[PDB]
Amino acid sequence: TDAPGALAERRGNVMVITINRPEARNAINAAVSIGVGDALEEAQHDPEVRAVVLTGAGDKSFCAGADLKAIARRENLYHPDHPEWGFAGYVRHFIDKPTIAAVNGTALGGGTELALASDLVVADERAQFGLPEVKRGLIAAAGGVFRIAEQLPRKVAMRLLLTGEPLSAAAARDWGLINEVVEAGSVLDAALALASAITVNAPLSVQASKRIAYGVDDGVVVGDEPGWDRTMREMRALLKSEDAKEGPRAFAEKREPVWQAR
Template sequence: MIITINRPAARNAINAAVSIALGNALAEAQRDPEVWVVVLTGAGDKSFCAGADLKALARGENIAHPDHPKWGFAGYVRHFIDKPTIAAVNGTAFGGGTELALASDLVVAGESASFGLPEVKRGLIAAAGGVFRIVEQLPRKVALAMLFTGEPITSSEALSWGLINEVVPDGTELDAALALAARITVNAPLAVQASKRVATGSDDGVVPGDEPGWSRTRREVATVFATEDAREGPLAFAQKRPPVWKAR
């Protein structure tokens, strides 16, 4: 199954409609015995996903899946399926875009792709798994530098640190992801799915090893997202001005 986030004019930022469609598609992939691999990509050539739609957040909109909030950001980051998932990253993957890549089993990226968790620049934290998954998937000091500075890394840097599997020429990301999927689907699907369940430590669709990270994230979100700075960050973004931090 190929799932495409189709909001190129908004850099494929995630709003409620995307969360609903993406989460439902992933659930369908899990149910369908003929789907053996899922490939996630973004429309256009500029951005895989710019993260949460900050303008929607500034308007007070809920961008989660209304029926399945436990699936997490975009209906994806906490939505375990035992079919392998591949992110085909075309262009920038910032904030939630990087968190979608972190939540995917494998990642193929274009030469000009970049990854970053800039939430601190908006008075927020990477609440969709980024704060604990980035430290798991990168060397600790590299990951902490990304979290503390909010600065991105290139696809070649991501490859060198093992964050992604392959860098390909721009415009060929989806083809490369499908080629990788073909290398998976020559194998017995039930064996692949069982291998993923064991490798990820999943039990009945839940990855217990992730639960402490989600619990800590919820606690910090309850504090940070209620601050004046958390309101100022998205508002400043929407108004196209530098934020004024107050540390409260």
Template sequence: MVTNRAVLTERRESVLLVTINRPEARNSVNAAVAEGIGDAIELARRDPDIRVVVLTGSGDTAFCSGGDLKDMAAGQALVPADPEKRAWGFGGICEHPIDKPVIAAVNGAAIGGGFEIAMACDLIVADDTAYFSLPEVRNGFLASAGGAVWLAQWVPRVVAMEILLLGDRFTAAQAKEWGLVNRVVPRGDALAVALEMAEVLAANAPLAVQASKRLVAGLVGTESVTDREAWARSNAEKKTIEDTEDAKEGPRAFTEKRPAIWKGR
């Protein structure tokens, strides 16, 4: 199965393997990636024979490096044109919950929105060479694809603040210590271990698995009612930031490979 060139899908019995396929761009998210992942998640939601989704990146250097800043600097949208698909959130998954388990196989860098895509999954398996960060503040943005919504629920407040405000990288081992990753495995093994976990999950009673996920994730239908208010605040802050000069300067500086000149407006 191929959703589109930017995202590959493969059925492995009751497991759907989804691969971001832009290794030349460190698997960064553009509109095609967002649509491809979102379509795959929607397929899994609708197909009763799919019990688990595994999401990974192609190559061995990046799971996903976040939004494509070159596209952003050029004024290109990172979301599909279809308004229903835009509602799925960043990467087609961050505001697109389903009650079937989704496992992230983090085979390299998970930066910015790439880390948020991993956080949108239920379980994370990471190579021991993988690393993570939410560097949005360094590019004139905020972590509006779920980072600011979810982090404070998962880690102590001071840790969430450090990750969000400093934007520093941290290792897979540190992520596991903080409770952000389930398993850290030798380089190159993340996908194999994630698929092994998927087989175990797929062998369990599907309705019980889905009900358990709904309860833990606070899902009613396809909405996370637990996070509803936090998402509303996050989206409002995102709109405020997007309209600033600094938000335009960040991608320009990245593309031009120079330090950003912040104006605070």
């Protein structure tokens, strides 16, 4: 085997990054973060690259979320040499070039956070979104807790965040959270077509427009810093809780968890 966690390939002036763990529903671990993060860095630096598409290998999963076995090992999910890029080497990894998530199937928790972190999203009609973290005693630590209400109407975002219940591709599109819903199996082609609608434009204009729209000073999205800081503060406490143990233990034991609030 020895296949990398993520592949990178070039379709003309678009870099296509494919999460490459279908045997594990394309869940994020450190190996995926290395593949994705390095490819994004290459995309940033190669002036022949005009856009990036992120997708998942196979026909069922974009990204099922953070790898639960890695969490259980109390293992870092991020690029080991680039903690500053966050989850998947992606969610706190600003690049000047447009990013499009091509959501080929399940996109729960971490998968939805990858969508939120992308500029644009095209989804297979079968794709499901959501932030179910609150059902397991953790939280959407990869940006979801503070970005969801930035990209969906506040009340709609709060229902998703607090219930942990999923959202169809159609409902995601209706709220303005993803851009387009496409026929089963066509998500990569559709995303490359959207990429083409951007890459025909003036590169310096697209790059400058991105930096201004996200409030970027020196490669950092300034406005996200308090969100990251608050998320990190809360996770530190939560990862120390008895309930964060019970969530996984209960799921495995096929019983409802019994929460203690400690």
